[PDB]
Symmetry: C2
Subunit: 309 residues, 2 copies
């Protein structure tokens, strides 16, 4: 059919994916703007076609306000179009460092939205597997914009199955069960949520080591702490929530639904501290800068490979 060409006006290119190009588009009737992932299905290899089918099915299931939603999936002659939310607010972590005031209450509001998106994924039998700063975006630059969970490239429909689904996810956010090659499921997203919450409170990660082997040993042992003096002003409730997420045995780890009912989340106005945390902002700026530098190094190596042939 020609449902896309007749209903949408294609605008400028926003970027490129593994096997696609993304362009802004505007719905002719509603006038609403979206981000369209355009894929040439004929040229697609069999392997990538399978990846696409899985992506479209999973994204179709995930209809929640705190998730980068896929509006429509249209197949035309040789191209397929995946119409998604147009997210322009950038990384949550980059926005936080520009704030004049940032407190526990603000951290709680952020993690509450992330947990809502995760609880929704889990209720639909899907595990994201790649929660990290780069995938926590803001809908737009507008004040109060919603936190959006992005990139479901590694998501899988685990449902009620029991097995080890491989090593995927970023190294500082991986859970003990994945590293131990034990069966794992939805709880891995909660572990990552705990790592993110820790960073949201002090600006640096709980598991950190230049030696990858040491990092994984650290994670497997659940070896993190709350160093003075920065953590001396953090409430016991924030720490308790983190402890419930960074529980090594997945069977004793809190679920997203349960986390959303904890006072520090549900009654943040009273239970979460309202004090400004300048050191968190300062540390987070360095955390972001370090990530940007590693990313630039990676970009350079990829550029070197493209040149060399």
């Amino acid at each position: 059919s020609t449902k896309f060409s007749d209903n949408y006006d294609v605008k400028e290119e926003l970027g490129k994916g593994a096997f696609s190009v993304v362009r802004r588009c505007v719905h002719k009737t509603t006038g609403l703007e979206f981000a369209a992932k355009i894929i040439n299905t004929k040229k697609l290899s069999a392997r990538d076609f399978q990846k696409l089918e899985r992506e479209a099915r999973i994204c179709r299931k995930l209809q929640h306000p705190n998730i980068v939603r896929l509006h429509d999936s249209i197949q035309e002659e040789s191209f397929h179009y995946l119409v998604f939310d147009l997210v322009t607010g950038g990384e949550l972590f980059e926005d936080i460092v520009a704030r004049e005031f940032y407190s526990e209450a603000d951290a709680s509001h952020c993690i509450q939205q992330i947990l809502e998106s995760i609880a929704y994924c889990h209720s639909n039998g899907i595990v994201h597997r790649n929660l990290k700063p780069e995938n926590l975006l803001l809908a737009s630059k507008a004040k109060g914009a919603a936190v959006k969970l992005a990139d479901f490239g590694l998501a899988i429909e685990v449902n009620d199955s029991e097995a080890w689904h491989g090593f995927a996810g970023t190294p500082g956010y991986l859970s003990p069960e994945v590293l131990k090659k034990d069966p794992y499921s939805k709880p891995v997203d909660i572990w990552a949520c705990g790592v993110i919450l820790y960073i949201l409170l002090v600006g640096y990660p709980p598991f950190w080591d230049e030696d990858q082997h040491r990092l994984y040993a650290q994670i497997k042992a659940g070896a993190y702490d709350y160093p003075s003096p920065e953590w001396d002003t953090v409430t016991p409730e924030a720490k308790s929530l983190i402890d419930s997420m960074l529980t090594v045995n997945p069977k004793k780890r809190i679920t997203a639904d349960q986390a959303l009912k904890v006072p520090w989340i549900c009654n943040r106005e009273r239970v979460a501290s309202a004090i400004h945390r300048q050191d968190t902002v300062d540390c987070l700026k360095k955390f972001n800068a370090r990530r940007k530098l590693k990313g630039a190094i990676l970009t350079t190596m990829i550029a070197t490979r493209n040149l060399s042939n």
Copy 2:
């Protein structure tokens, strides 16, 4: 700015600034806003920024990025330009099915018209290079636009040496000899670009800049066989008149626009497809993206260290 525009998706990045699409609240008109962080700029730096704004506002031409407004707020400055979303010219050329001399001529004609306009207004760009040649959009027939007037100066009829500004591979002998220079430097750069547009590689290149600057001052370049054997003498003639060591003997933009290869490209410029040029241009762009990646890394390294101190 914040009370009159709303920022949208990112269109690009660079030194201490990002370029994002923005929408004028009242009119609904779209523009490209260059957000510049000025928290560190000195009094003289701001003067240079106001210079760029002044120059751009003085330049209203169909082949030049048009500045709509210039606003300075708390810690940021905003330069609002028309939306230019076609990307870099060199990137678009390597994606064409057919690319001939006539196509290169059409590009050069547009670049010359933009330069002739600048020159007639007493302005010398000083930074004519690949990355500053953009296309209005992805549409066919999209006009070429001259961008980045960050180094442009109102030389008018004055004569003196204005410093070592610009990219080495495009620098003119006068500049390298520290002799007085003016509008002609843009013509020399245009000649280097024309040479690249025809075969895919630069006329002046070498390991160490010493020999590189040595061959430039001597105006020592060649038309190697077999690629140049299919290029018209008129194309080579125009290049020769642009790559003339003596500024006073170098062809002007107004003069170049009257050359048959330019004003009658349909007959004088070859129409044969130059696949070898497309292939070479791909490696040329790849090398360009690599250097850009190297620069980004150095910037990121500086940013991180700047925070530590």
